[PDB]
Amino acid sequence: MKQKVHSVSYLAKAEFEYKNGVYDLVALPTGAEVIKISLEVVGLPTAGHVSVGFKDESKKNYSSILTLPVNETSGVVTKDYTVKSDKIVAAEVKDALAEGSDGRPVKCVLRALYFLPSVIEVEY
Amino acid sequence: MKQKVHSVSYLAKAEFEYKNGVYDLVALPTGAEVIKISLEVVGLPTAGHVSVGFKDESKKNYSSILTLPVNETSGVVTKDYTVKSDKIVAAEVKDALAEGSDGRPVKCVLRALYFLPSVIEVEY
Amino acid sequence: MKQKVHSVSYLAKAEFEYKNGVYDLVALPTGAEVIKISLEVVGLPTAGHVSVGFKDESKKNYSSILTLPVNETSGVVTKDYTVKSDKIVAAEVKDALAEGSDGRPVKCVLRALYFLPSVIEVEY
């Protein structure tokens, strides 16, 4: 057989402080293939929501792809995307209070596993 | 410590037209380790089912590993497989009508992330 | 844009015999990023539980991160971890009987996909 496959893959870590606002976490090239986005909450928040989505490089085209309330504290996107003009992974925390129930800062870590647009030919 | 790990990993994209029949999407070498198969439905189908599975290179040994009705529109296989004599990822659409509710062709994209059988030795 | 990404990724296979006790399966470097741990049960066990978790290199700090009863036979960890002083993936089988309902040895395979701590700079 013969096929075209993506041979280069990167993983990007970003961390934000679980504070109200928006954050630009992962930079993505055009044609990249996102196969994993995992959001992790380190700490014990009491009230808030974290929504991760795709935002354009400059124009404010944010659109949440995964929502995450307080209780589950972790979440992976259920769908795989191909990058086209939406080259920023962004996070939004619309509700956020202080450290919360512990006196320690609640943080969030987003890990993005994506394959580069470069393609090679393999025969099996 | 010391261990043997897979150092080479590929991602394969395939696209089909959500039409009745079968399609051979991803070619796999013997000993490859499939760690991800994600199926995505781009469009608004109204009636149908897509079943992805493993088929032998020539003999008709199709066996569905993931079923996908219309409503969820996306699905990832829940199990990881090691390739042995079943070297084709294949898709079957047994029910399929026209574009559907939009006038635009409904398509499906299958992304397969698999590690090559080549192994190196790493000490930590 | 500009960002720092992990460019090196490994996959490790380990196999154990579904027998009562503990097993040290995957060796992990400090700063490595675990993005996948999948546990697979090959065979037909009748009674038992398999708990996978992180154990320190020498000191007995086992802590299960995923539990797996008999019936589902497969499971992936729901959270991503960064390695720090907990550099062993370990499995524990606290209940285990003979081959079980088939006369053939029940085995378990754990696949660990993790990115190396090495980081490069990419501009998009």
DSSP C31-42: T-EEEEEEEEEE
> Which residue among C12, C27, C40 sits closest to B80, beta carbon to beta carbon?
C40
From CA B32, how far away is CA B114, in angstroms rounded? 6
What are the φ/ψ torsions at residue C18 (nearest 5 degrees)? Answer: 50, 55
Answer for the pair A6, B11: CB distance below 8 angstroms, yes or no: yes
Q: Which chain C residues are closer than 8 Å to B7 by Cβ?
A: 10
- The count of other CB atoms within 10 Å of the CB of residue B2 is 8
Experimental technique behind these coordinates = cryo-EM
> Which residue among A11, A38, A57 sits closest to C5, beta carbon to beta carbon?
A11
The full set of domain ranges for chain A reads: 2-117
Residue of C nearest to B120 (CA): C10
What are the φ/ψ torsions at residue B81 (nearest 5 degrees)? Answer: -125, 150
Decide: helix, strand or coil at residue B46.
Answer: coil
Closest alpha carbon to B35 in A115, A13, A81? A115
H helices of chain C, where? Answer: none
Token representation of residue B34: 């499939």
Domain A2-117, CATH class in plain words: mainly beta
Closest alpha carbon to A92 in A7, A23, A13? A23
Domain B2-123, CATH class in plain words: mainly beta
Answer for the pair B2, B123: CB distance below 8 angstroms, yes or no: yes
From CA B122, how far away is CA C25, in angstroms rounded? 14
CB contact under 8 A, A35 and B11: yes
Query: From the CA atom positions of chain A, what is the Rg in Å?
Result: 16
From CA B1, how far away is CA B104, in angstroms rounded? 56
Token representation of residue C7: 């460019």
Closest approach of B10 to chain A, Cα-based (Å): 5
Name the E strands within A1-124.
Answer: 2-6, 9-16, 21-27, 33-42, 48-55, 63-69, 74-76, 81-82, 88-96, 107-115, 119-123
From CA C112, how far away is CA C35, in angstroms rounded? 8
Token representation of residue A12: 């990007």
Q: Quick one: DSSP state of residue A84?
A: S
